[PDB]
Structures are given as C-alpha cells and as structure tokens.
Design a protein around this motif. Structure first.
Motif, PDB file in Angstrom:
ATOM      1  N   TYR A   1       4.099 -11.555  -3.172  1.00 52.50           N
ATOM      2  CA  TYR A   1       3.650 -10.654  -3.740  1.00 52.50           C
ATOM      3  C   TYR A   1       2.642  -9.819  -2.911  1.00 52.50           C
ATOM      4  O   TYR A   1       2.258  -8.599  -3.027  1.00 52.50           O
ATOM      5  CB  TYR A   1       3.126 -10.773  -5.234  1.00 52.50           C
ATOM      6  N   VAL A   2       1.940 -10.536  -1.972  1.00 57.01           N
ATOM      7  CA  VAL A   2       0.732  -9.792  -1.220  1.00 57.01           C
ATOM      8  C   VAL A   2       1.538  -8.780  -0.206  1.00 57.01           C
ATOM      9  O   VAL A   2       1.048  -7.851   0.305  1.00 57.01           O
ATOM     10  CB  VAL A   2      -0.193 -10.790  -0.652  1.00 57.01           C
TER      11      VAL A   2
ATOM     12  N   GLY B   1       3.256  -5.584  -1.633  1.00 53.45           N
ATOM     13  CA  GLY B   1       1.889  -4.810  -1.807  1.00 53.45           C
ATOM     14  C   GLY B   1       2.235  -4.037  -0.626  1.00 53.45           C
ATOM     15  O   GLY B   1       1.773  -2.695  -0.541  1.00 53.45           O
TER      16      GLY B   1
ATOM     17  N   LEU C   1       4.484  -1.376  -0.390  1.00 55.71           N
ATOM     18  CA  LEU C   1       4.317  -0.575  -1.191  1.00 55.71           C
ATOM     19  C   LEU C   1       3.128   0.499  -0.825  1.00 55.71           C
ATOM     20  O   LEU C   1       3.102   1.820  -0.866  1.00 55.71           O
ATOM     21  CB  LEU C   1       3.750  -0.857  -2.635  1.00 55.71           C
ATOM     22  N   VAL C   2       2.177  -0.096   0.039  1.00 54.83           N
ATOM     23  CA  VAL C   2       1.158   0.962   0.544  1.00 54.83           C
ATOM     24  C   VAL C   2       1.859   1.616   1.716  1.00 54.83           C
ATOM     25  O   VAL C   2       1.199   2.733   1.939  1.00 54.83           O
ATOM     26  CB  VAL C   2       0.130  -0.220   1.152  1.00 54.83           C
TER      27      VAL C   2
ATOM     28  N   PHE D   1      13.678  -4.284  -9.234  1.00 50.94           N
ATOM     29  CA  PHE D   1      12.373  -4.469  -9.986  1.00 50.94           C
ATOM     30  C   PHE D   1      11.250  -3.195  -9.976  1.00 50.94           C
ATOM     31  O   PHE D   1      10.215  -3.364 -10.597  1.00 50.94           O
ATOM     32  CB  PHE D   1      11.736  -5.803  -9.497  1.00 50.94           C
TER      33      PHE D   1
ATOM     34  N   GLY E   1      -5.476   9.218  -0.360  1.00 51.19           N
ATOM     35  CA  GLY E   1      -4.047   8.679   0.135  1.00 51.19           C
ATOM     36  C   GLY E   1      -3.275   8.162  -1.176  1.00 51.19           C
ATOM     37  O   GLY E   1      -2.386   7.876  -0.617  1.00 51.19           O
TER      38      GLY E   1
ATOM     39  N   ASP F   1      -1.615   9.234  -3.748  1.00 51.55           N
ATOM     40  CA  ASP F   1      -1.069  10.481  -4.620  1.00 51.55           C
ATOM     41  C   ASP F   1      -0.111   9.967  -5.496  1.00 51.55           C
ATOM     42  O   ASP F   1       0.481  10.726  -6.419  1.00 51.55           O
ATOM     43  CB  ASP F   1      -0.152  11.364  -3.512  1.00 51.55           C
TER      44      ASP F   1
ATOM     45  N   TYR G   1       2.462   4.088  -7.548  1.00 50.13           N
ATOM     46  CA  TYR G   1       2.905   2.719  -6.897  1.00 50.13           C
ATOM     47  C   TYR G   1       2.014   2.459  -5.595  1.00 50.13           C
ATOM     48  O   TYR G   1       1.903   1.248  -5.180  1.00 50.13           O
ATOM     49  CB  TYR G   1       4.451   2.693  -6.253  1.00 50.13           C
ATOM     50  N   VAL G   2       1.197   3.138  -5.298  1.00 46.28           N
ATOM     51  CA  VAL G   2       0.614   2.897  -4.167  1.00 46.28           C
ATOM     52  C   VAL G   2      -0.664   2.148  -4.637  1.00 46.28           C
ATOM     53  O   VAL G   2      -1.520   1.439  -3.731  1.00 46.28           O
ATOM     54  CB  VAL G   2      -0.020   4.328  -3.512  1.00 46.28           C
TER      55      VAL G   2
ATOM     56  N   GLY H   1       0.212  -1.292  -5.457  1.00 44.26           N
ATOM     57  CA  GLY H   1      -0.220  -2.159  -4.450  1.00 44.26           C
ATOM     58  C   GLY H   1      -1.326  -2.712  -3.993  1.00 44.26           C
ATOM     59  O   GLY H   1      -1.629  -3.895  -3.726  1.00 44.26           O
ATOM     60  N   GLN H   2      -2.466  -1.904  -4.327  1.00 46.95           N
ATOM     61  CA  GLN H   2      -3.904  -2.249  -3.864  1.00 46.95           C
ATOM     62  C   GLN H   2      -4.258  -3.639  -4.992  1.00 46.95           C
ATOM     63  O   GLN H   2      -4.602  -4.498  -4.666  1.00 46.95           O
ATOM     64  CB  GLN H   2      -4.701  -1.287  -4.240  1.00 46.95           C
TER      65      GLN H   2
ATOM     66  N   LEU I   1      -1.988  -5.527  -6.070  1.00 42.25           N
ATOM     67  CA  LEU I   1      -1.237  -6.814  -5.638  1.00 42.25           C
ATOM     68  C   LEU I   1      -2.005  -7.379  -4.560  1.00 42.25           C
ATOM     69  O   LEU I   1      -1.872  -8.512  -4.275  1.00 42.25           O
ATOM     70  CB  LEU I   1       0.008  -6.276  -5.229  1.00 42.25           C
ATOM     71  N   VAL I   2      -2.648  -6.358  -3.778  1.00 35.41           N
ATOM     72  CA  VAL I   2      -3.279  -7.074  -2.472  1.00 35.41           C
ATOM     73  C   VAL I   2      -4.757  -7.432  -3.017  1.00 35.41           C
ATOM     74  O   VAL I   2      -5.163  -8.553  -2.295  1.00 35.41           O
ATOM     75  CB  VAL I   2      -3.530  -5.684  -1.605  1.00 35.41           C
TER      76      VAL I   2
ATOM     77  N   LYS J   1      -4.788  -9.712  -5.390  1.00 38.47           N
ATOM     78  CA  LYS J   1      -4.546 -11.037  -6.068  1.00 38.47           C
ATOM     79  C   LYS J   1      -5.120 -10.803  -7.596  1.00 38.47           C
ATOM     80  O   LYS J   1      -5.534 -11.706  -8.009  1.00 38.47           O
ATOM     81  CB  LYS J   1      -4.970 -12.187  -5.449  1.00 38.47           C
TER      82      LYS J   1
ATOM     83  N   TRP K   1       1.368  -4.284 -17.142  1.00 45.84           N
ATOM     84  CA  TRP K   1       2.791  -3.583 -16.437  1.00 45.84           C
ATOM     85  C   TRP K   1       3.352  -4.782 -15.402  1.00 45.84           C
ATOM     86  O   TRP K   1       4.531  -4.863 -15.586  1.00 45.84           O
ATOM     87  CB  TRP K   1       2.597  -2.400 -15.525  1.00 45.84           C
TER      88      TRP K   1
ATOM     89  N   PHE L   1       7.080  -6.311 -15.531  1.00 46.30           N
ATOM     90  CA  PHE L   1       7.858  -5.686 -14.433  1.00 46.30           C
ATOM     91  C   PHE L   1       7.600  -6.825 -13.277  1.00 46.30           C
ATOM     92  O   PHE L   1       8.349  -6.661 -12.207  1.00 46.30           O
ATOM     93  CB  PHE L   1       7.432  -4.359 -13.770  1.00 46.30           C
ATOM     94  N   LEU L   2       7.017  -7.652 -13.066  1.00 44.20           N
ATOM     95  CA  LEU L   2       6.516  -8.607 -11.882  1.00 44.20           C
ATOM     96  C   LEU L   2       6.028 -10.100 -12.543  1.00 44.20           C
ATOM     97  O   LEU L   2       7.071 -10.932 -12.697  1.00 44.20           O
ATOM     98  CB  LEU L   2       5.618  -7.934 -10.962  1.00 44.20           C
TER      99      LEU L   2
END
Lengths: 89, 89
Positions: A43-44, A47, A50-51, A88, B38, B40, B43-44, B47-48, B50-51, B53, B84, B88-89
């Motif tokens: 999952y990292v 991410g 996704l970025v 997903f 950056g 916009d 989902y971006v 991602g953060q 998720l990064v 943890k 979420w 979804f995860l």
C-alpha cells in the motif's frame, strides 16, 4: 505471455498488508531494494502510483531509477497496479 | 458534533475524480491551497495518507504546515480518509 497467477489473484481480492514483493513484476531481489527505500508494504507503493496520476512514463522511470527494474518488469507492475485500482478505486 | 452529510456520503460511495475540496475537513479556501501544491484531485491526497502509513501526527503536521489547517479540521480529514480506507482498502 501468461502473467503468473499472482496477477489475477492480486486484482481478485483486497491487498491487505501483503509485502511489496507480492506485487506482480517485483521479484524477491527487487522487493528487497524497495524495502530498504522505506516501502516495506504494497500500500505504500500503491500510494506512489496514485501520486503519479498513473503517469506510465513517470512510474516506469521511478521504479527503474529506484531499483533498476527492466522494461519488462515495469509493464507487469503498471498493468497490475492499474487493474487493482480499476477494481478497488 | 455531527460531521456534515459529506463525511457519511464520502465513506458511502467510491471517491472517483471528485476535487480535493470534496474531502471532509477541507473547505473551499483550503482546497485551493492544496490545489496550488499539485493536489488538484482527492486521490492524490489519499496517496499522501497511504505514504504516511496512517501516522496521525505526521499527517496532521503535514496538512497544517502545508496549508495552515487548524487542529479541528485535521481531525475531520483523518477520520474521513481513515474510514474511506476501511471500506475501500
């Protein structure tokens, strides 16, 4: 030709906390370099995808410059991560 | 007390390509600063999360140092993004 059963198994059920080396296209040696880079779980890495807004060229250069993966192994991770998101996300 | 209906609506259906300002806790003014950074799309930003943890302290300091959100608004984004992922995860 036929992606290993892991490709279909990964996009067939949640990813949970499976290790990075579980992603299709990443072998045990490659999963180890990403792990030293701070990506001990998939999952990292997702991410990061996704970025990059799914930018295939930015993703492939990121994985190759990050570990040295070849053009073949990057294709498996792109379609593998991209298909998981289609189911997903 | 009661999170706006957006909190329950967001964790009740996929996020698709909804704008960052759609995440609970982010107002139109705050969504604008992340957009200049950056981010916009939501989902971006996910991602953060998720990064990091799900590190709540690292996430809150990241959002506050990134836009200036208050302690109250960071709590809504944490539980909102965290819930979420639970669905979804």
């Amino acid at each position: 030709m036929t992606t290993s059963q892991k490709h279909r198994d990964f996009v067939a059920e949640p990813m949970g906390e499976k290790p990075v080396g579980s992603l299709a296209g990443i072998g045990e040696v490659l999963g180890k370099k990403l792990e030293e880079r701070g990506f001990d779980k998939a999952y990292v890495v997702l991410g990061q995808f996704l970025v990059l807004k799914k930018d295939e060229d930015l993703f492939r250069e990121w994985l190759k410059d990050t570990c040295g993966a070849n053009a073949k192994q990057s294709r498996d991770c792109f379609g593998c991560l991209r298909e998981w998101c289609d189911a997903f996300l």
